[PDB]
Amino acid sequence: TDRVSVGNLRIARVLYDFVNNEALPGTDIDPDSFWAGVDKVVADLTPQNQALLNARDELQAQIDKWHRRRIDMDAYRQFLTEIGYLLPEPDDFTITTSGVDAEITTTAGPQLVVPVLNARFALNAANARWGSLYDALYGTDVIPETDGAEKGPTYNKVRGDKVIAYARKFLDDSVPLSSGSFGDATGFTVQDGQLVVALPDKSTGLANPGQFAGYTGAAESPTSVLLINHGLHIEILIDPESQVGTTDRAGVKDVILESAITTIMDFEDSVAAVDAADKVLGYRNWLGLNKGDLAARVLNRDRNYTAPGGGQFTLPGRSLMFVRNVGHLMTNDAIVDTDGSEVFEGIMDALFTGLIAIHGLKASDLINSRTGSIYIVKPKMHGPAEVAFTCELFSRVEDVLGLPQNTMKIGIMDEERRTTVNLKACIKAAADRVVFINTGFLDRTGDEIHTSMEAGPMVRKGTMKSQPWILAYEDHNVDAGLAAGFSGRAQVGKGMWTMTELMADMVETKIAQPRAGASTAWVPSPTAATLHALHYHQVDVAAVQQGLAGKRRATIEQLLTIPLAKELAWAPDEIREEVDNNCQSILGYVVRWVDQGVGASKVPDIHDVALMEDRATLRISSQLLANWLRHGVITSADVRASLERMAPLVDRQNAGDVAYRPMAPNFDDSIAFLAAQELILSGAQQPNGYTEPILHRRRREFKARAAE
Numbered sequence: 124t125d126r127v128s129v130g131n132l133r134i135a136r137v138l139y140d141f142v143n144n145e146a147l148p149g150t151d152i153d154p155d156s157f158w159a160g161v162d163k164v165v166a167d168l169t170p171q172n173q174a175l176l177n178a179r180d181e182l183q184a185q186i187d188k189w190h191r192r193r194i195d196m197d198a199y200r201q202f203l204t205e206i207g208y209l210l211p212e213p214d215d216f217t218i219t220t221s222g223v224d225a226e227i228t229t230t231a232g233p234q235l236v237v238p239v240l241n242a243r244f245a246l247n248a249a250n251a252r253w254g255s256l257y258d259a260l261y262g263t264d265v266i267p268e269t270d271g272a273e274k275g276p277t278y279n280k281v282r283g284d285k286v287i288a289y290a291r292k293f294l295d296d297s298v299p300l301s302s303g304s305f306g307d308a309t310g311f312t313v314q315d316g317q318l319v320v321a322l323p324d325k326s327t328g329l330a331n332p333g334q335f336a337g338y339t340g341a342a343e344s345p346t347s348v349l350l351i352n353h354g355l356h357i358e359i360l361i362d363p364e365s366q367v368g369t370t371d372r373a374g375v376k377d378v379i380l381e382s383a384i385t386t387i388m389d390f391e392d393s394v395a396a397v398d399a400a401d402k403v404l405g406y407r408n409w410l411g412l413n414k415g416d417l418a419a420r421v422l423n424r425d426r427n428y429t430a431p432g433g434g435q436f437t438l439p440g441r442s443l444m445f446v447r448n449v450g451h452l453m454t455n456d457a458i459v460d461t462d463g464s465e466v467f468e469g470i471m472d473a474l475f476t477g478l479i480a481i482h483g484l485k486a487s488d489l490i491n492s493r494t495g496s497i498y499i500v501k502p503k504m505h506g507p508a509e510v511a512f513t514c515e516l517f518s519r520v521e522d523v524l525g526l527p528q529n530t531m532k533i534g535i536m537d538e539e540r541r542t543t544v545n546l547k548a549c550i551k552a553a554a555d556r557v558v559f560i561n562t563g564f565l566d567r568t569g570d571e572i573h574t575s576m577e578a579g580p581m582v583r584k585g586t587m588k589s590q591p592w593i594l595a596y597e598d599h600n601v602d603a604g605l606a607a608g609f610s611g612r613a614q615v616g617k618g619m620w621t622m623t624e625l626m627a628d629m630v631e632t633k634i635a636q637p638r639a640g641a642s643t644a645w646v647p648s649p650t651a652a653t654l655h656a657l658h659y660h661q662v663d664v665a666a667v668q669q670g671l672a673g674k675r676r677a678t679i680e681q682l683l684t685i686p687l688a689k690e691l692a693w694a695p696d697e698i699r700e701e702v703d704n705n706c707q708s709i710l711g712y713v714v715r716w717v718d719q720g721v722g723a724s725k726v727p728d729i730h731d732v733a734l735m736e737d738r739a740t741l742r743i744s745s746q747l748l749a750n751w752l753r754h755g756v757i758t759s760a761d762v763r764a765s766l767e768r769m770a771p772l773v774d775r776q777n778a779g780d781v782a783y784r785p786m787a788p789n790f791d792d793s794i795a796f797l798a799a800q801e802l803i804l805s806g807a808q809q810p811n812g813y814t815e816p817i818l819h820r821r822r823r824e825f826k827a828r829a830a831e
């Protein structure tokens with residue numbers, strides 16, 4: 124084999140080399156010490172990791188059995204308490220996490236999430252700290268393409284005028300003038316450290332002069348004006364000779380928004396990595412990001428400004444980077460033990476993404492965390508014992524890397540039921556590591572379906588978004604964060620907007636999240652980060668949070684309200700739509716996962732809306748159908764017929780891609796098609812409804828076949 128023996132471990136050579144040749148150089152960690160550390164940490168922690176998965180299994184078994192005889196909430200709740208699922212609430216406390224950067228403790232704004240395996244996308248995400256508001260308005264449906272204002276091959280001035288007026292209005296609302304409207308500005312100057320805006324008849328300053336943050340060029344004719352509102356920067360670019368500037372009353376070329384404040388470079392649900400070669404591609408991108416030399420094009424430099432009073436200063440040109448490790452479940456043959464057993468991938472991720480993140484603590488030839496923290500999102504944890512395990516894992520990794528204890532900070536996904544109901548105790552277990560909690564509502568829906576699989580038929584996938592359990596889950600998450608002192612200390616975050624082309628709807632709708640006191644929320648693209656930033660200028664999240672302090676808005680009974688469908692909820696046409704819709708989203712995602720190793724794709728649904736799909740959306744679609752099949756809402760022939768009906772549609776959607784292999788008409792010769800079918804027909808048997816076991820197995824099967 125092409126493997127390296129270190130103690131009880133046999134490491135894939137490609138990984139061994141990457142680490143020694145790329146990762147370690149620059150850290151002052153002795154490769155021998157490092158690799159002995161890995162060996163020791165894997166040996167020491169594997170048994171507990173396994174004991175934690177066995178616990179999940181024991182609890183799920185008891186819940187399945189409970190439902191199988193034959194809904195009284197008192198009885199159910201007492202049952203969960205007995206089996207140790209629902210634990211006592213601990214006493215009130217405040218988190219003590221220290222050494223966290225401002226982007227996290229203080230600044231409320233969008234949080235962008237991107238697959239680390241795609242270098243181009245990850246570079247765009249890192250650079251998304253700043254984004255053009257004009258581009259985001261012009262290029263999306265936020266400005267409707269009504270008669271006259273449609274996008275063409277060239278610049279539509281009528282449309283550009285609409286974009287300009289939208290932004291003027293945004294300016295009036297965020298940084299108001301003492302008198303008049305930005306809409307009437309004829310120019311800008313800096314006089315005695317204050318911003319002066321020329322109107323046709325008079326001149327005026329800002330209603331709040333402190334919102335003036337700096338400028339570029341000469342004070343007497345600046346090339347830009349930097350402002351600030353709710354801790355977020357806005358930069359007005361001034362160039363009267365530019366395409367847009369020429370048409371503007373004040374020569375304004377663009378409005379730039381501080382957009383993606385933080386970014387999550389994702390190793391988990393948005394990527395497909397099933398072996399060492401895949402993991403190294405990812406690790407190598409994460410490395411390039413932390414050393415600042417990743418190029419595919421390049422990472423942006425910081426931005427230079429002149430303070431209003433006079434001095435020179437700099438603002439970060441890049442988003443503060445988190446890394447999302449995989450969770451406690453999967454193994455990966457990147458490392459196997461002497462018996463040939465695969466090593467836990469979560470343990471590996473901590474060691475390797477942690478090692479790599481050390482580079483982001485030093486200057487590149489610039490520094491991710493100026494305060495000396497490494498920020499790791501840990502997904503899919505079930506309850507506070509699993510949180511304590513991750514804390515212990517990070518502690519041992521810190522020892523191996525020779526980092527101070529508590530350098531490795533954790534972002535907690537609240538996306539499993541047993542975490543939701545024990546949320547306070549989960550935060551407590553990580554009281555000195557936590558830098559965010561976040562409602563991963565898609566995985567959480569998946570877990571909701573799977574946990575109560577045996578209870579009865581669930582409501583339709585779309586209906587889930589408005590069910591009592593989920594509304595209480597969202598409020599409870601904010602309540603718990605605030606009560607543990609998150610305000611000024613840690614992010615309270617909410618979930619992803621998946622409809623990538625429906626920006627007008629996002630701008631209208633997603634404002635609900637900061638209005639709920641979330642200091643951040645997930646977006647799938649730089650464009651959507653710039654647009655979601657608008658919401659943070661409209662809502663003073665700090666003030667919302669202080670207004671919510673000490674409120675308890677969700678009860679345990681609400682949280683435990685199982686989304687069962689009522690008697691006779693659906694007509695045959697409604698059931699057919701749901702099945703077609705779920706099969707098409709599943710097929711669309713899985714075919715690119717299994718055949719091309721693409722972990723995140725835009726897949727248009729049955730209504731032709733483009734959805735950004737990843738494993739969590741897959742978990743829902745597959746679990747929901749598995750539930751309907753388990754309870755006789757639909758037959759196995761309904762499932763089959765639907766898969767066979769949507770497959771050619773999916774083939775058509777991919778008809779370009781040179782690397783695409785049609786699934787139709789020889790379905791059963793397609794490894795991707797069979798993966799899709801297995802996800803549904805075996806869904807009920809997957810641990811907590813997880814999709815990884817099947818995706819990994821089939822993706823590996825496909826690679827192996829391609830090599831013959």
Ligand SMILES: Cc1ccc(F)c(C(=O)CC(=O)C(=O)O)c1Cl
Pocket residue numbers: 236237389392393538562563564565566567618619621647723735736737739740
């Ligand atoms: C890029 C992307 C697209 C869709 C998603 F659902 C996600 C999440 O990964 C969601 C999530 O954790 C949760 O809701 O469970 C991503 Cl990143």
Ligand SMILES: [Mg+2]
Pocket residue numbers: 392502536538563565566739
């Ligand atoms: Mg998730």
Ligand SMILES: [Mg+2]
Pocket residue numbers: 353663
């Ligand atoms: Mg305000």
Ligand SMILES: [Mg+2]
Pocket residue numbers: 183807808809810811
């Ligand atoms: Mg089971």
